[PDB]
Design a binder for this molecule. Structure first.
Ligand SMILES: CN(C)CCOc1ccc(-c2nc(-c3ccc4c(c3)CC/C4=N/O)c(-c3ccncc3)[nH]2)cc1
Length: 259
């Protein structure tokens, strides 16, 4: 069972902000990753959030998903996971811009694809896959994380247009989880964030959701296969329903992987 005996977790250093809470490096039967919520006495609205996330993490078990160890509430609402020695992808491609190699970038693509496949089969929708929620553990293995938004405003440049247009209270879908996977391709394939030459969020928001703006797909490393090119295109396709699902994505990647 999943509630960790209280006052069994040490926490050392602080690492950044998460989604409900803040993240820290800590101990619990080893190096672990802890995300907790400072706030002493917290909201009905907040511990909902936490009850929810937990409710979903408990359901995952799979190499490519960050591995839920436990959760506690006394003295604070804390989620614990394995520690990833390494960095988020984001932090690779755009902080220390790691010249990675093209087979490794397709591997990362495919490992993400694997994780998303797993997620969707279980009817989980991340709603916030982005290169920040992908931690690359011992550079070889991918773990999707941060299940604050998951289920059964977030980070903008991975939002599919229909999330953006905010057409009806709930416009999320495997299909949207796919549009974000496509921006992750766009980053992998181009060592870059989309829309670099625009500095006004609000504008991007508008422009993308309305269809006027979309990733310049011609910025993609030349070493890059063209099928992976066609794939990103099919992934990003503005019209919700045109986008392949993960099983088919997995397939496409795996296929062209024999090169
Ligand atoms: C914001 N500012 C501090 C600039 C510097 O930026 C940051 C750098 C790095 C990060 C960063 N978040 C996580 C993170 C995100 C979500 C969650 C966890 C860690 C643990 C449980 C969880 N649940 O959703 C990690 C990480 C995770 C696992 N292993 C190692 C690390 N790393 C966050 C911010």
């Amino acid at each position: 069972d999943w509630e960790i005996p209280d006052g069994q977790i040490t926490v050392g250093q602080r690492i950044g902000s998460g989604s409900f809470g803040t993240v820290y490096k800590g101990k619990w039967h080893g190096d672990v990753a802890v995300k907790m919520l400072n706030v002493t006495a917290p909201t009905p609205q907040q511990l909902q959030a936490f009850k929810n996330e937990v409710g979903v993490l408990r359901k995952t078990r799979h190499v490519n998903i960050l591995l839920f160890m436990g959760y506690s509430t006394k003295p604070q609402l804390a989620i614990v996971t394995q520690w990833c020695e390494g960095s988020s992808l984001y932090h690779h491609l755009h902080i220390i811009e790691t010249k990675f190699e093209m087979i490794k970038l397709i591997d990362i693509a495919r490992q993400t694809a694997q994780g998303m496949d797993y997620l969707h089969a279980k009817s989980i929708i991340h709603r916030d896959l982005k290169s920040n929620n992908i931690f690359l553990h011992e550079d070889l293995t991918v773990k999707i994380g941060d299940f604050g938004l998951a289920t059964v405003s977030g980070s903008i440049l991975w939002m599919a247009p229909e999330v953006i247009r905010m057409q009806d209270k709930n416009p999320y879908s495997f299909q949207s989880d796919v549009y974000a996977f496509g921006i992750v391709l766009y980053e992998l394939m181009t060592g870059q964030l989309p829309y670099s030459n625009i500095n006004n969020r609000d504008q991007i928001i508008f422009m993308v959701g309305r269809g006027y703006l979309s990733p310049d797909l011609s910025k993609v490393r030349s070493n890059c296969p063209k099928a992976m090119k066609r794939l990103m295109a099919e992934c990003l396709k503005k019209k919700r329903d045109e986008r392949p699902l993960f099983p088919q994505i997995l397939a496409s990647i795996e296929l062209l992987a024999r090169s």
